[PDB]
Write an enzyme that holds these catalytic residues in place. Sequence first.
Site, PDB file in Angstrom:
ATOM      1  N   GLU A 110       2.011  12.321 -11.472  1.00  0.00           N
ATOM      2  CA  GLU A 110       2.192  12.325 -12.795  1.00  0.00           C
ATOM      3  C   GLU A 110       1.013  11.391 -13.722  1.00  0.00           C
ATOM      4  O   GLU A 110       0.873  10.394 -13.256  1.00  0.00           O
ATOM      5  CB  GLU A 110       3.515  12.026 -13.351  1.00  0.00           C
ATOM      6  CG  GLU A 110       3.651  11.896 -14.853  1.00  0.00           C
ATOM      7  CD  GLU A 110       5.167  11.498 -15.064  1.00  0.00           C
ATOM      8  OE1 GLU A 110       6.007  11.177 -14.159  1.00  0.00           O
ATOM      9  OE2 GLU A 110       5.478  11.270 -16.511  1.00  0.00           O
ATOM     10  N   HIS A 120       0.920  -1.323   0.009  1.00  0.00           N
ATOM     11  CA  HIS A 120      -0.135   0.040  -0.043  1.00  0.00           C
ATOM     12  C   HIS A 120       0.967   1.245  -0.050  1.00  0.00           C
ATOM     13  O   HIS A 120       2.124   1.243   0.230  1.00  0.00           O
ATOM     14  CB  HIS A 120      -0.854   0.010   1.434  1.00  0.00           C
ATOM     15  CG  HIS A 120      -0.126   0.070   2.519  1.00  0.00           C
ATOM     16  ND1 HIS A 120       0.215  -0.877   3.379  1.00  0.00           N
ATOM     17  CD2 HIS A 120      -0.079   1.431   3.274  1.00  0.00           C
ATOM     18  CE1 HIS A 120       0.732  -0.360   4.406  1.00  0.00           C
ATOM     19  NE2 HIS A 120       0.644   0.664   4.534  1.00  0.00           N
ATOM     20  N   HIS A 127       8.030  11.898  -6.930  1.00  0.00           N
ATOM     21  CA  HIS A 127       6.541  11.839  -7.363  1.00  0.00           C
ATOM     22  C   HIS A 127       6.276  10.240  -7.688  1.00  0.00           C
ATOM     23  O   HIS A 127       6.820   9.338  -8.103  1.00  0.00           O
ATOM     24  CB  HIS A 127       6.502  12.641  -8.621  1.00  0.00           C
ATOM     25  CG  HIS A 127       7.077  12.191  -9.920  1.00  0.00           C
ATOM     26  ND1 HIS A 127       8.539  12.687 -10.118  1.00  0.00           N
ATOM     27  CD2 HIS A 127       6.675  11.523 -10.921  1.00  0.00           C
ATOM     28  CE1 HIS A 127       8.856  12.571 -11.114  1.00  0.00           C
ATOM     29  NE2 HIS A 127       7.823  11.710 -11.880  1.00  0.00           N
TER      30      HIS A 127
HETATM   31  C1  LIG Z   1      -2.080   1.378   6.120  1.00  0.00           C
HETATM   32  C2  LIG Z   1      -1.970   2.640   6.159  1.00  0.00           C
HETATM   33  O1  LIG Z   1      -0.570   3.078   6.039  1.00  0.00           O
HETATM   34  C3  LIG Z   1      -0.865   3.316   7.260  1.00  0.00           C
HETATM   35  P1  LIG Z   1      -0.243   2.212   8.496  1.00  0.00           P
HETATM   36  O2  LIG Z   1       1.104   1.641   7.922  1.00  0.00           O
HETATM   37  O3  LIG Z   1       0.321   2.865   9.983  1.00  0.00           O
HETATM   38  O4  LIG Z   1      -1.131   1.031   9.054  1.00  0.00           O
HETATM   39  C1  LIG Z   2      10.330   8.419 -15.370  1.00  0.00           C
HETATM   40  C2  LIG Z   2      11.169   8.927 -14.226  1.00  0.00           C
HETATM   41  O1  LIG Z   2      10.262   9.815 -13.618  1.00  0.00           O
HETATM   42  C3  LIG Z   2      11.250  10.482 -14.256  1.00  0.00           C
HETATM   43  P1  LIG Z   2      10.240  11.400 -15.494  1.00  0.00           P
HETATM   44  O2  LIG Z   2       8.937  11.575 -15.251  1.00  0.00           O
HETATM   45  O3  LIG Z   2      10.775  12.937 -15.552  1.00  0.00           O
HETATM   46  O4  LIG Z   2      10.638  10.745 -16.897  1.00  0.00           O
HETATM   47 ZN   LIG Z   3       1.658   1.535   5.933  1.00  0.00          ZN
HETATM   48 ZN   LIG Z   4       7.845  10.479 -13.715  1.00  0.00          ZN
END
Ligand SMILES: C[C@@H]1O[C@@H]1P(=O)(O)O
Ligand SMILES: C[C@@H]1O[C@@H]1P(=O)(O)O
Ligand SMILES: [Zn+2]
Ligand SMILES: [Zn+2]
Lengths: 147, 134
Positions: free
Chosen positions: B114, B6, B65
């Site tokens: 993105e 997750h 990102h």
């Molecule tokens: C599952 C959601 O990220 C939070 P946790 O890692 O504190 O459980």
């Molecule tokens: C793919 C890697 O994240 C970088 P970009 O989004 O600048 O190409």
């Molecule tokens: Zn977590």
């Molecule tokens: Zn990227």
Amino acid sequence: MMLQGINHICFSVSNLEKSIEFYQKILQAKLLVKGRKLAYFDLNGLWIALNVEEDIPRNEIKQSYTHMAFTVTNEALDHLKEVLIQNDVNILPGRERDERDQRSLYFTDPDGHKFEFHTGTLQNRLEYYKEDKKHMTFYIAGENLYF
Amino acid sequence: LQGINHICFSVSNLEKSIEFYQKILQAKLLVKGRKLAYFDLNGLWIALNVEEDIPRNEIKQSYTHMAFTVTNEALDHLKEVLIQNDVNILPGRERDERDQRSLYFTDPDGHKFEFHTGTLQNRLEYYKEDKKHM
Ligand SMILES: C[C@@H]1O[C@@H]1P(=O)(O)O
Ligand SMILES: C[C@@H]1O[C@@H]1P(=O)(O)O
Ligand SMILES: [Zn+2]
Ligand SMILES: [Zn+2]
């Protein structure tokens, strides 16, 4: 319109050479190509990029609980904690847990990006909270009552 | 490692972020709480945890990102979705044509995202074709 799925993750790193060894060792990512400002990894089908940003402030990130979790088994979790210890990784104190939350290990990369090794799933976490909910349910409308 | 379990984002305002994740990333809400919310996005477990008190200004200088796959006309349409929802749109980086098309933006708390129209393989080849050329 729609998003089809996850495309890639990019991490801003201050040292391409040391971040590569972190993502290879700790996250078991497979290096696919590298320049002097970029590195591409395959992590079980996931595209991971490291892009160099050389001098930016990286202090506030330590205060944010934003993190990314990967799935491991219970024996693997205990193997990895030792690996993180012998590789000098900043291991975070996690939050207090319930046993039903399943076990976790929290840590960061050399630039403060928080990661997590998790033994549970969304299933369990939803099965957790739903059992808790069932605990607080005493009259199930539709049931036949005696009297 | 068995893959991604997750991803969790710390947010300052739950309802304000939940809307973003609902309307912009099109994540399907599973459960809300006082300081939490769980989604399913293209099979990905997305979680929000609230943290109101923390400083969120330095996150602007980091290129960190997460990208999602979209078609080129999804991108065109999504660009108006962003603008219409007053989404923090960042100007793009300089791109070769073979970089394929992208659109960069942030959630209310500065987490960068993105919408991308290419694949890694698309990118590797653009890199490989460069080697072949030289
Ligand atoms: C599952 C959601 O990220 C939070 P946790 O890692 O504190 O459980
Ligand atoms: C793919 C890697 O994240 C970088 P970009 O989004 O600048 O190409
Ligand atoms: Zn977590
Ligand atoms: Zn990227």
